[PDB]
A paper describes a structure:
Immature retroviruses are built by the Gag polyprotein; Gag is then cut into domains, and the resulting CA capsid proteins form the mature capsid, which can mediate infection of a new cell. Murine leukemia virus (MLV), the prototypic member of the γ-retroviruses, is commonly used in comparative studies and as a basis for retroviral vector design. The CA domain and immediate downstream residues mediate protein interactions in the immature shell, and, following proteolytic cleavage, CA forms the mature viral capsid. In this study, we have determined the structure of the truncated MLV CA-CTD by X-ray crystallography and have resolved the architecture and CA lattice structures of immature and mature MLV particles by cryo-ET and subtomogram averaging.
We identified 1,299 pentamerically coordinated positions from the 134 virions in our dataset, extracted subtomograms at these positions, and iteratively aligned and averaged them to generate a structure of the mature MLV CA pentamer at a resolution of 8.6 Å. CA domains were fitted into the map as rigid bodies. The CA-CTD layer displays high curvature at the pentamer positions, and the CA-NTD pentamer protrudes further outward from the CA-CTD layer than in the hexamer. Comparison of the interfaces between neighboring CA molecules in the pentamer and hexamer revealed subtle differences in these interactions but no dramatic opening of the interdomain cleft as we previously observed in the HIV-1 pentamer. The MLV CA-NTD pentamer is more tightly packed around the fivefold symmetry axis than the hexamer, resulting in an even narrower pore in the center and higher local positively charged electric potential contributed by arginines in the β-hairpin. The mature MLV cores consisted of flat areas of lattice joined at seams with locally higher curvature, and with pentamers positioned at the highly curved vertices. Within spiral or nested cores, more than 12 pentamers are required to accommodate the increased total curvature, and we observed as many as 24 pentamers within a single virus particle. As the total curvature of a multilayered structure is greater than that in a sphere, more than 12 pentamers are present in MLV particles. The presence of pentamers, rather than gaps as in the immature lattice, suggests that having a CA lattice without holes may be important during early stages of the MLV lifecycle.
Author numbering:
A (entry chain D), C (entry chain B): 1 to 236
B (entry chain C), D (entry chain A): 159 to 236
E (entry chain A): 80 to 158
Amino acid sequence: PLRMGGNGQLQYWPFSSSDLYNWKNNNPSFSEDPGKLTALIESVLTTHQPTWDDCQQLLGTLLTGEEKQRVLLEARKAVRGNDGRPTQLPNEVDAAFPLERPDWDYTTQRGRNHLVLYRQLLLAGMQNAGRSPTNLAKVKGITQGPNESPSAFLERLKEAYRRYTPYDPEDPGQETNVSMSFIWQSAPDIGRKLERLEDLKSKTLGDLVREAEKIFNKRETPEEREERIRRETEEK
Amino acid sequence: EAYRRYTPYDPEDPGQETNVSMSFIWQSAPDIGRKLERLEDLKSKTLGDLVREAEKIFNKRETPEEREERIRRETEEK
Amino acid sequence: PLRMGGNGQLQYWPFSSSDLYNWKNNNPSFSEDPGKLTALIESVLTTHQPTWDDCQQLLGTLLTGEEKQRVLLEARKAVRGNDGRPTQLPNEVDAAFPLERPDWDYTTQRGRNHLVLYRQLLLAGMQNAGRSPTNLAKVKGITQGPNESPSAFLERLKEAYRRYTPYDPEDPGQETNVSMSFIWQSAPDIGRKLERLEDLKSKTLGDLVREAEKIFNKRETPEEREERIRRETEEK
Amino acid sequence: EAYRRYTPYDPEDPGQETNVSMSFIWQSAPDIGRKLERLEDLKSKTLGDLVREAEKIFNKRETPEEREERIRRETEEK
Amino acid sequence: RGNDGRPTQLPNEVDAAFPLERPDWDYTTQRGRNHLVLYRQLLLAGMQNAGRSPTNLAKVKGITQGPNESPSAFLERLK
């Protein structure tokens, strides 16, 4: 880690192994749920200002050999030339994201800039490495749970679009597509009512969530239902 | 036809293409849908592309006669 | 450990025993899997900038008596004379990798250079000691498991090359060699398809892994298979 | 050779190519013939093309040893 | 190749270098000899390029030393 010392100069100290192992032990593996470790590492990359060696310890400790490899190749694939476009030119790729220890000196603006870029690319690598290619079945498999709010369900549905399709669920051109999955895969009472909405074509995704909440928010409390039953007085 | 009759969305609109495409993939016959889902650069496939890819699988129907012949020539007993 | 202080001067502090014991407890023994501790120590040698005494604590804590001995003799065998060749001259060996506390002063360029070299040789020692006499049968014995991903299998295969051969599986000159083992020892369905690839000679190790993943990723779910069987409707 | 010996047609004549091609497809081994028949743009295939396509199938012979190994690893009992 | 060292599909050039019908090349003349040299060179090139034998790694893995087979004989079959 690096921090600005009291004398206006960067100061280095190695990661405590307790931090590294705590981060590992309090999160799922990268493969299980890439978002967890990616968010943790994104944070640490900022607060701990790791050097290249520090990043090797992070990756080496939190990822398996196969995960780290995926991340490193993904990071190198994220390198851009001075024209802002991808580049596979060995010298450019190596200069941005070196696989072997670089001579970056954190006391120099040159060293610092490389470190900044390295960390940015590392993050990109992790973000991209966490992609279950395309698998539409995963999107169709997101079904609202019986206690799950419509907004929570929609967020899980969008997460599946992100992970398992090439479509961005936040794109304006995807709205009807996400809307149809939302209606079809909502809890059955909700989906049947959303399907019956007047001027359904006119409903935004936000509108549909609000309409589903009205039904959900009409959950008819268990206690209430039980009370009704008791006061049923209809015998057989 | 179902989009036309039972939704306000025109399935021929350019803005509906991904929507119709997703229904097409999801509701195709299971062998076809599983293969369309696995297409490389799926995001880049038009509705016309998806139909052509599905036809390749369908057109690989593996004739009933052919299948039966294979079974006969199976020679694997139990 | 040493770090550059806020005053531009190296600053020393002893290892926290919690770090040493955490490193030990979160890894296999050196004998079980030398790569684990070797990678951890390689990292620490950089981030913690250990002195000679610090290195003795590292080794003393993470390795058994027999492992440490192997490593130390391997490190001394890695010493090079000024002509870049191996040397068994006692004075040269002792000067580079002393078995007893040296008078190295980290506040001097002389002391620092010796420390750098010492750490480099220590790493070399570990890398070579983790070199279980050459045993090609161990490499041929790495076979992809029925649930094992191609990338996970390749990492195990590379680990066997490292431990049981003198060949570095990451060398460009070893690529076809590792590729052939990868094809031959992949799961049978995968190996048969990789063998049939068009322009096979042109496939990199990375290409082969991606092609194997396409087959693996076509795993044909157990549920799916069962469903197919049920819908079989072919009786006897 | 059979065309030469037992017909008046020269199998190397450009005007005989489709004729020889059809015999080649029809009289190839059954697995090969069925696949050649299914080739896309079959009309466009020369005799040389057809031979190369048949070689791809033949060259996919699925070694006896390989087949046996598969069977052994079958683990499906009856 | 044409005189500019590049490929050519010009019938007259192709025919002149590698004729499909008997040419009038006279081996007692430097002209005839040079054409013969070129013809042979092109014939070799043709064979080299027509080659391109389909790959099949299973065939290489299938070469196993026989119980009576000497190591050098086995190595030659493997090669």
